[PDB]
Design a protein around this nucleic acid. Structure first.
Ligand SMILES: [Mg+2]
Ligand SMILES: [Zn+2]
Ligand SMILES: [Zn+2]
Lengths: 246, 149, 76, 99, 1331
DNA sequence: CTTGACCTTCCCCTTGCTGGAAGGTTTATAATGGGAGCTGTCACGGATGC
DNA sequence: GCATCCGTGAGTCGAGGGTAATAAAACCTTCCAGCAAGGGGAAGGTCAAG
RNA sequence: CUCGA
């Protein structure tokens, strides 16, 4: 169901997922043995002969559960809830060792190494090496892609500065910060820099002329001074500092 | 349920206040998808009461992160229930066990570059069998104010 | 001259003159109405200019001469 | 009613609840922030406060924290850790009487 | 316009800007929402409210174009003019501008020559000041107190005039004369002779000259008319719920108007003085609470208990108009989505969602839908997009094709952080990216997001195909290495495809070509690993342009044959015959790019990615728990270390060893115990014994699944396999001290409870270090771009005949930077020739490239002189030839490329990655330089100088080793002897600094008195002591003036000569001068007289040019040295030249180390103390070529140690940008000691002293400036005001009348114009020439 | 293309007031000096003040 | 001149939530609107014959 | 303020 990537283990040293994979494979092997013994509808004294053999395979385990004091109807309800796989607890720093995983994999007729010989889907050949296959508890996450995608052509310009707003719920364009203005200066692309300052964002007689030029079918730049510069002139001039052009 | 847990899944589901736990013990008298009526045992009763506890589960509502909240019952009609059991599993609970995601087959091999730099290649039977399809509940509001005109 | 522009830049000489020459030529076919020289084979007016440059048919001196002769023809 | 409603609703510690899990609801209440009034800030905290002191063993968890700008400032209370009657963090132990 | 001018504002200028005097503090009405008469929003002053309507509504409808209504006075125009009309407030008292008062320096006490502490007692109504005194008992500006004024009023009457308040300072500035004080200071400047005052009087003279040059008057510092911002830049807008929402300037303005009206009312009530003096103070406080809020006293708070944002808080910081709304804007036609990998693409393509390209290309879709007649108008063409009909998705495929689109990912560190791709159309909601460009973006597919920007015009659409397409950026601008080097999965596939087993299912067979090796692999008859003999046909193109085929049977595998159908024609078979790790693939792509071009390299890099993904999928390389193999001799080594630690423990439990010895013994026996396991696991991993063709046991390198990811360089190193089989080495608690017991358990066996808690100090330290490293590494890049913003290639060649000289680095041991890549790419300066000193092999100025540099590598050349950026002669930009080679493309750089942005981005990008005996190593010859030496008594050599360095030459000429050797070492060999690798050539003591006599003659202990001048110490163990002297502070303070000079003479007493010169030889006595050999002894040369005993912030310290705390001082001029005056803490020393000017002295504190003694000789620029040296003194004493060579050998030891390659040319650009302001010392053109540009002081001598007159002289001295200061002292003040300290930069450039010119390319970004670099540079010359 | 007859909306006007909005002026026992907020960064450069 | 005191800096790009508190009273004045049902007239727009 | 790269 999922083909993950094996190059992420040695750079990060999370070898917990390989052991969790092997233990999940052992658990589902037991849970398919019980499903095969239930689909044949054999007995109830056979389930007590196997599930009891599955519940004590450690060395010094804490819990001791015996299915002698279980009635002949509660064992069927118990084995009905283990058809999808026997659940396994493994506490934090009191974990199950590597010998116990191999002692559990041999109960449900599984390979001790944990790797099987997978065939390809497209071409039908088999791979050279064996491939690790098991079960990993995969989560979903709240960073869905329907709430990240966003696009905007024109709309809802701001009040004072007359450059477009910010926010996906606000329907605003992305910010072309000075980290990108340096990167466009370095390429030498001056005509992409003159466009992304005046005619796309900040001019007032610039956007509504470029829109008519584009709809008319004539891509031609029409420049002008930005509106954010002759607000800076009015805010410097209000300090009693005469600033002009020539 | 998670196949490989740490045994701490049982304590976090109960104490989080997201399930419906029984105060007194007894036999379940009536199970609906909304309410659960439990008949109290004899010795766990008080001498001026009628001895029925009624739990009203909360169906599809809105959380703060705009996800679902929904409590389904997990007991059947006419079965005994002791004190402190779990009668209704909430959003991510399963017979009183915390269960956040779902478990599925995993192979560790590079497959034509589609899992290149921590990418994941997902088969179609995860999409078909409705394993990861979540439910979101939004809230839209239209308010009619008073203008001067 | 769709994938890479290595063939075109070794005729004009540098990238910043190639851009200005191709932008001048690509506007005579947009709104001026002058016809292209290379066959079009379903392309926009940018790649037709970048293919006219790379086969020696469009330069800066040729683009100056070809419009000065037509301004003299407009004088007549 | 201005001061009480100002605290419950505008402080830096009366924050919105993450409710997209049973887990994320329960680990947002056992969260020991270090910011707020009478504390640090994210521009005046060096490498010394964000470090794992050797007396964090069994009171405040070492591997449960954010990794953004406030990496060591938002701590997390451990499992068995209780709060004293004064406010300090006590943790249980078993006595050893003559081996 | 072409220039911005800025100056002070007269009240006539403010009345000329104004449209009407504001009189009332009212804003609007409360019942209707209309502006009130003469308010802050008034319709008469600032224009109408709606389009072409007055207030009363008497005129409308565009017929009345410019009439003024007679009822309400409103001029019928557009409402657009509310953003351009200003008003003014007529203040009832003058008040002081806070910028020209409380900036540092004061700028109003700098003119009046009065301290700020004295001015603020007059602005606050606390103390009077005397404007003029008719009787000269009261001088000018003599501050009287409150009660002293009552005595001075009655002693004189009305002969003096004293005032208090801002009108006192206004009448003080009004009643001064600039033309008297200017000539007075200009005559007393060249009368006095000092340094501490001529650095201030020059500044006051330059301020007084700048006032009369700019044409200003000093009375305009004090405001009398205050201007009002237009009422659409401080708006009052109603929100949705009926609550208004104002800006905060309508509070400060309302306070100014309220207190001004109250002062107008108080002056007509004839109020007492305690009320009016308080009211004027409150008016001044309300004015400077508006101009700049948090400067005068407590900041003014609003109702939210927050400081109100004033006018100066709107242009500064990260929230001003400069840094947030002018340099970087929010743009239209933009997008944002989650990126995903897709390997079916080509190198110039990218995916795009349909629902994103339908929204970005919407006006193009309207323009295409109207042209084909599918919709008659735009309002009927929008409905065809709102329905998502059939014909829209077939028009979008015509609109999109041959239309590139940018792809930016934040943070955009370097130049490759934004690239332009050719889009395709996929369904879904995720931008599909090509897997090879992720090395440039540094993008991991774990939830990253990328921004999508469209180019609109026809010029920008051609700047994304020929300048920013991803098939043009396959070489990094940092260095000539490729940047489309393949990543982890494709390199694992290429490593697995090129290997060899032993049996391998059908080895030894012979094949025809590579096309019958795929047919064998696909049918399964032969494995991918084998050892066969195929017959290939490789093409060598050493024939000039022509390709010669040749055929030979090669012994190779099957996989190396099945790969060779991909490699292009010109490459040879020795590039795929190896094991093909990670370095070999990038080496192969670099070889293909250098040899064959650009057009085959893109196809090759695409086919390598298409093949490496395929043959890695067929293999299957899974990590299992059986792959991490514990070495079987692991418990034995840990048990032996546990045995050996108990011996040191029991030796410490009794008294045999101290604690500091045990703590190091435990570490030293744990380190070797860790390495004995790290050796064992690696020696078990890499060897697998397989059966041969016979029954044998042959070993090969292994096919372990976790060794192949480490050996191929795909993921992980050998340092992280040690943490999976061997033990974790030695963790460290955050104090810095190493914990004694180590983590003896690895990640396969699982850690303990305490061993996991100990392992969290290092991880939390390394994770909280990255959150505080990136702030400094992203602040250094901002400080670096804003210095070198305006360095563009301007000329093509200037004849300069000079440049720095290259040399491979030879420190300590082996060479760390060879000559092959250090000199590569730069042109040569002088025609360097063969070691046989004729036969010029390369001409004067040729581009040293490949096929030229290996020709140097064949010969034994060692030092080529190259042109460099720090010595170019042009103005406002460097030559093309003086720069070198454009590292991106691979040719000479073109006139128009901005250098300094590329250099600043190239230095600042990897900063987030940063954080005795002489034993020769080989056999060669020995050379020495600047060496005076005599033989010793035993037959060896001693050294009597400081500058000598032992330089091992090889057999051909290049220096393989260079070893320092101090003064007073006793060698074992002589100059120029054959040596053996490992031998010792120098023997000298590490702790002491002896003072060995060179003279072969008798000694006599002269001129020493025991008790008053020297001391006495007898050797209590041996007895062979002599007359010693104590230290500096411990000795007697009665005889520090009488210098004990041990004057060595013979048995007669005759002054023995220094060897080779007539003067006598003495040996003087500093502190701790303990002499050993007794009086009257005969010595030879080589005989001792005495033995006196003894990361990234480094880069930010170098580029800021901060002087270090303990600087290694240097001698100013050449000469002989004697100590002069006596120790008042610091006793002087004089540098008396033999041939120059005697009386230069200095001042040495802290008498730790004096490398020169009181009779030895020095030079200019040598060592006197020891330690780090300041970069200013290297410029002052040594040349400019020793500063630009000191930095590029010091910042290149931070990047080299971490493993970051950066070409050295990118550092000399900003070193050129540092030493740009140059101070003059003589005069003849401009002034005496002012700091001008070196570019303006060079154009003067290129004009004045050639044909106007003779050498009138403009001799200067260069000066070094840090990068926080070389950008605040430029010419264009707009390039400085956007960087840092906007108040100081705008104040300093407003009293001087500074004129901007818009030269650089950060002012053209503000004013919305074409920058003078790149494609704008060709256009800019047609503006500069026709002007 | 021409004349008088009809339409439209909109502004002003008829009494006997009444309701409301916006502005100005006094009032006499005796009251006589504020209070909110800050402390858990580090590193410079460079005024400044004996 | 030199210890000490004060000013100015401290990464980028995206989500989501938000958008508050409380403080005299009697007297006088002028000006404007409205209301019980229309009447009157003025500046524009149509109609039906001639 | 909390979260993501
Ligand atoms: Mg990422
Ligand atoms: Zn009007
Ligand atoms: Zn030059």
């Amino acid at each position: 169901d999922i083909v993950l990537n094996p190059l992420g283990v040695p750079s990060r040293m999370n070898i917990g997922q390989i052991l969790e994979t092997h233990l999940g494979m052992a658990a589902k092997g037991i849970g398919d043995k019980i499903n095969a013994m239930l689909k044949q509808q054999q007995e109830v004294a056979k389930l007590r002969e196997f599930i009891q053999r599955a519940y004590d395979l450690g060395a010094d385990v804490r819990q001791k559960v015996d299915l002698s004091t279980f009635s002949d109807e509660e064992v069927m309800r118990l084995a009905e809830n283990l058809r999808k796989g026997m659940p396994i607890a493994t506490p934090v720093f009191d974990g199950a060792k590597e010998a116990e995983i191999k002692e559990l994999l041999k109960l449900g007729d599984l390979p001790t190494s944990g790797q099987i010989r997978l065939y390809d889907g497209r071409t039908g050949e088999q791979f050279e090496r064996p491939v690790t296959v098991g079960y990993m508890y995969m989560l979903k996450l709240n960073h869905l892609v329907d709430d990240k995608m966003h696009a905007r052509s024109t709309g809802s310009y701001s009040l004072v500065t007359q450059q477009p707003l910010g926010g996906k719920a606000q329907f605003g364009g992305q910010r072309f910060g000075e980290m990108e203005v340096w990167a466009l200066e370095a390429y030498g692309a001056a005509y992409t820099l003159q466009e992304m300052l005046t005619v796309k964002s900040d001019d007032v007689n610039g956007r509504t002329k470029m829109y008519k030029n584009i709809v008319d079918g004539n891509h031609q730049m029409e420049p002008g001074m930005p509106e954010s510069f002759n607000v800076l002139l009015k805010e410097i001039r209000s300090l009693g500092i005469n600033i002009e052009l020539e | 349920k998670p196949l490989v847990g740490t045994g701490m899944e049982r304590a976090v589901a109960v104490d989080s206040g997201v399930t419906a736990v029984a105060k007194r013990g007894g036999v379940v008298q009536y199970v609906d998808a909304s309410r659960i009526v439990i008949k109290v045992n004899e010795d766990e009763m008080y001498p001026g009461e009628a001895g029925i506890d009624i739990y009203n589960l909360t169906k599809y509502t809105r959380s703060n992160q705009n996800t679902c909240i929904n409590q389904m019952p997990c007991v059947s009609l006419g079965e005994p229930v002791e004190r402190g059991d779990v009668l209704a599993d909430g959003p991510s609970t399963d017979l009183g066990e915390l269960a956040l995601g779902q478990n599925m087959r995993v192979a560790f091999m590079p497959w034509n570059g589609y899992n290149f730099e921590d990418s994941i290649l997902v088969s179609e039977r995860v999409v078909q069998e409705d394993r990861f399809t979540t439910i979101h509940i939004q809230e839209l509001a239209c308010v009619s104010r008073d203008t001067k005109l | 001259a769709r994938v890479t522009v290595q063939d075109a830049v070794e005729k004009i000489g540098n990238r910043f003159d190639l851009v200005l020459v191709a932008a001048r030529r690509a506007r005579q076919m947009q709104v001026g109405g002058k016809d292209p020289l290379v066959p079009e084979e379903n392309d926009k007016t940018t790649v037709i200019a970048l293919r006219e440059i790379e086969e020696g048919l469009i330069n800066n001196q040729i683009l100056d001469v070809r419009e000065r002769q037509e301004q003299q023809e407009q004088e007549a | 009613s201005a001061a009480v409603k100002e605290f419950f609703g505008s402080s830096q510690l009366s924050q919105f609840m993450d409710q997209n899990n049973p887990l994320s609801e329960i680990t947002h209440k056992r969260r020991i922030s270090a910011l707020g009034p009478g504390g640090l800030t994210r521009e005046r905290a060096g490498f010394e406060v964000r470090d794992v002191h050797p007396t964090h063993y069994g009171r405040v968890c070492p591997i449960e924290t954010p990794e953004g700008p406030n990496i060591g400032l938002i701590n997390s209370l451990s499992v068995y850790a209780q709060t004293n009657e004064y406010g300090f963090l006590e943790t249980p132990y078993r006595k050893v009487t003559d081996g | 316009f072409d220039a911005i001018k800025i100056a002070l504002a007269s009240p006539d200028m403010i009345r000329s800007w104004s449209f009407g005097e504001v009189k009332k503090p009212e804003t609007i009405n409360y019942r209707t929402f209309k502006p009130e008469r003469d308010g802050l929003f008034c319709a008469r002053i600032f224009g109408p409210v709606k389009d072409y309507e007055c207030l009363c509504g008497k005129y409308k409808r565009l017929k009345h174009r410019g009439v003024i209504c007679e009822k309400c006075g409103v001029e019928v125009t557009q409402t657009k003019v509310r953003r351009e009309r200003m008003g003014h407030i007529e203040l009832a008292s003058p008040t002081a501008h806070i910028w020209f008062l409380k900036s540092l320096p004061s700028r109003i006490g700098l003119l009046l020559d009065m301290p700020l502490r004295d001015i603020e007692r007059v602005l606050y109504f606390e103390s009077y000041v005397v404007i003029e005194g008719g009787m000269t008992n009261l001088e000018r500006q003599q501050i009287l107190t409150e009660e002293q004024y009552l005595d001075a009023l009655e002693e004189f009457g009305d002969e003096f005039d004293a005032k208090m308040g801002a009108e006192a300072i206004q009448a003080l500035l009004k009643s001064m004369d600039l033309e008297q004080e200017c000539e007075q200071l200009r005559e007393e400047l060249n009368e006095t002779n000092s340094e501490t005052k001529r650095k201030k009087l020059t500044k006051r003279i330059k301020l007084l000259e700048a006032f009369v040059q700019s044409g200003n008057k000093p009375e305009w510092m004090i405001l009398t008319v205050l201007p009002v911002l237009p009422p659409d830049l401080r708006p009052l807008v109603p929100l949705d719920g009926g609550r208004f929402a104002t800006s905060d300037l309508n509070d400060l303005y309302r306070r100014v108007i309220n207190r001004n009206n109250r002062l107008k009312r108080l002056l007509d009530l004839a109020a007492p003085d305690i009320i009016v003096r308080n009211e004027k103070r409150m008016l001044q406080e309300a004015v400077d609470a508006l101009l700049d809020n948090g400067r005068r006293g407590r900041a003014i708070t609003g109702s939210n208990k927050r400081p109100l944002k004033s006018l100066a808080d709107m242009i500064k910081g990260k929230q001003g108009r400069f840094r947030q709304n002018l340099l970087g804007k929010r743009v239209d036609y933009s997008g944002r989505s989650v990126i995903t990998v897709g390997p079916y693409l080509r190198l110039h393509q990218c995916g795009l969602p349909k629902k994103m390209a339908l929204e970005l290309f919407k006006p193009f879709i309207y323009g295409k839908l109207e042209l084909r007649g599918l919709a008659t108008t735009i309002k009927a063409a929008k409905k065809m997009v709102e329905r998502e009909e059939a014909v829209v998705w077939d028009i979008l495929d015509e609109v999109i094709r041959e239309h590139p689109v940018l792809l930016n990912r934040a943070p955009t560190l370097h130049r490759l952080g934004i690239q332009a791709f050719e889009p395709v159309l996929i369904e879904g909601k995720a931008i599909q990216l090509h897997p090879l460009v992720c090395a440039a973006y540094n993008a991991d597919f774990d939830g990253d997001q990328m921004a999508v920007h469209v180019p609109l015009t026809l010029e920008a659409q051609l700047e994304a195909r020929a300048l920013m397409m991803s098939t043009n950026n396959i070489l990094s601008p940092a260095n000539g290495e490729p940047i489309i080097v393949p990543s982890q999965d494709v390199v694992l596939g290429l490593y697995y495809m090129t290997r060899d087993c032993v049996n391998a299912k059908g080895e030894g067979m012979v094949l025809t070509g590579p096309k019958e090796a795929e047919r064998l692999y696909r049918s399964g008859l032969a494995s991918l690993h084998a050892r066969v003999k195929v017959r290939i046909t490789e093409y060598e193109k050493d024939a000039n342009g022509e390709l010669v085929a040749k055929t030979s049977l090669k012994d190779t595998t099957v996989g190396r044959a099945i790969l060779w159908m991909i490699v292009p024609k010109g490459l040879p078979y020795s590039i795929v015959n190896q094991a093909l790790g990670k370095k070999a693939i990038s080496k192969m792509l670099n070889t293909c790019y250098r040899i064959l071009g650009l057009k085959p390299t893109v196809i090759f890099a695409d086919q390598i990615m298409y093949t490496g993904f395929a043959y890695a999928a067929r293999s299957g390389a899974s990590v299992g728990i059986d792959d991490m193999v514990i070495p079987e001799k692991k418990h034995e080594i840990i048990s032996e270390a546990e045995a050996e630690v108990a011996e040191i423990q029991e030796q410490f439990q009794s008294g045999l060893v101290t604690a500091g010895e045990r703590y190091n013994k435990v570490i030293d026996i744990w380190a070797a115990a860790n390495d004995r396991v790290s050796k064992a696991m690696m020696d078990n991993l890499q060897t697998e014994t397989v059966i041969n063709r016979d029954g044998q046991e042959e070993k090969q390198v292994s096919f372990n699944s976790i060794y192949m990811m480490a050996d191929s360089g795909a993921r992980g190193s050998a340092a992280q396999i040690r943490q999976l089989a061997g033990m974790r080495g030695l963790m460290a608690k955050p104090d810095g001290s190493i914990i004694e017991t180590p983590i003896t358990a690895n990640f396969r066996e699982g850690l303990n409870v305490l061993q996991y808690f100990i392992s969290t100090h290092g991880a939390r330290k390394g994770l909280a270090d990255t959150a505080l490293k990136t702030a400094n590494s992203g602040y250094l890049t901002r400080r670096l771009v804003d210095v070198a913003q305006d360095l563009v290639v301007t000329e093509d060649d200037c004849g300069t005949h000079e440049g720095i000289m290259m040399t491979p680095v030879i420190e300590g041991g082996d060479v760390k930077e060879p000559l092959r890549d250090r000199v590569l790419g730069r042109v040569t300066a002088e025609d360097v020739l063969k070691p046989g000193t004729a036969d010029i092999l390369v001409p004067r100025n040729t581009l040293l490239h490949e096929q030229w540099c290996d020709l140097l590598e064949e010969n034994s050349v060692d030092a080529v002189k190259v042109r460099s950026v720090v010595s170019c002669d042009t103005d406002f930009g460097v030559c093309a030839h003086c720069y070198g080679r454009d590292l991106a493309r691979g040719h000479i750089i073109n006139k128009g490329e901005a250098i300094g942005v590329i250099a600043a981005q190239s230095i600042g990008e990897p900063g987030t990655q940063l954080t005795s005996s002489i034993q020769v190593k080989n056999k060669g010859s020995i050379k020495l330089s600047n060496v005076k030496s005599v033989v010793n008594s035993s037959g060896k050599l001693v050294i009597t100088s400081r500058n000598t360095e032992l330089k091992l030459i090889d057999e051909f000429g290049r220096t393989k080793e260079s070893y320092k050797v101090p003064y007073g070492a006793v060698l074992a060999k002589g100059d120029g002897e054959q040596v053996a690798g490992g031998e010792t050539v120098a023997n000298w003591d590490p702790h002491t600094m002896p003072v060995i006599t060179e003279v072969s003659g008798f000694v006599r202990f002269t001129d020493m008195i025991d008790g008053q001048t020297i001391t006495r110490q007898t050797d209590e163990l041996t007895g062979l002591s002599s007359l010693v002297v104590l230290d500096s502070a411990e000795r007697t303070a009665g005889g520090k003036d009488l210098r004990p000079a041990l004057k060595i003479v013979d048995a007669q007493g005759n002054d023995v000569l220094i060897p080779g010169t007539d003067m006598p030889a003495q040996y003087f006595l500093p502190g701790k001068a303990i002499v050993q050999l007794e009086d009257g002894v005969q010595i030879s040369s080589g005989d001792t007289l005495a033995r006196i005993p003894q990361g990234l912030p480094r880069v930010a310290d170098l580029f800021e040019a901060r002087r270090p705390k303990e600087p290694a001082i240097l001698a100013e001029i050449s000469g002989i040295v004697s100590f002069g005056k006596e120790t008042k803490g610091k006793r002087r020393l004089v540098i008396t030249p033999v041939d120059g000017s005697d009386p230069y002295e200095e001042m040495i504190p802290k008498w730790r180390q004096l490398n020169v003694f009181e009779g030895e000789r020095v030079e200019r620029g040598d060592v006197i103390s020891d330690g780090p040296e300041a970069p200013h003194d290297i410029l002052r004493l040594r040349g400019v070529h020793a500063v630009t060579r000191y930095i590029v050998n010091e910042v290149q030891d931070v990047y080299r140690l971490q493993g970051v390659k950066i070409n050295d040319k990118h550092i000399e650009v900003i070193v050129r940008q540092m030493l740009r302001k140059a101070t003059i010392v003589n005069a003849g053109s401009s002034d005496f000691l002012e700091g001008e540009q070196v570019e303006y002081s060079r154009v003067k001598i290129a004009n004045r002293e050639l044909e106007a007159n003779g050498k009138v002289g403009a001799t200067y001295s260069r000066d070094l400036l840090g990068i926080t200061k070389a950008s605040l002292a430029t010419e264009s003040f707009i390039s400085a005001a956007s960087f840092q300290e906007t108040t100081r930069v705008l104040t300093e450039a407003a009293v001087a009348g500074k004129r901007d010119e818009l030269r650089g390319l950060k002012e053209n970004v503000i004013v919305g114009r074409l920058i003078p670099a790149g494609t704008g540079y060709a256009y800019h010359q047609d503006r500069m020439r026709r002007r």
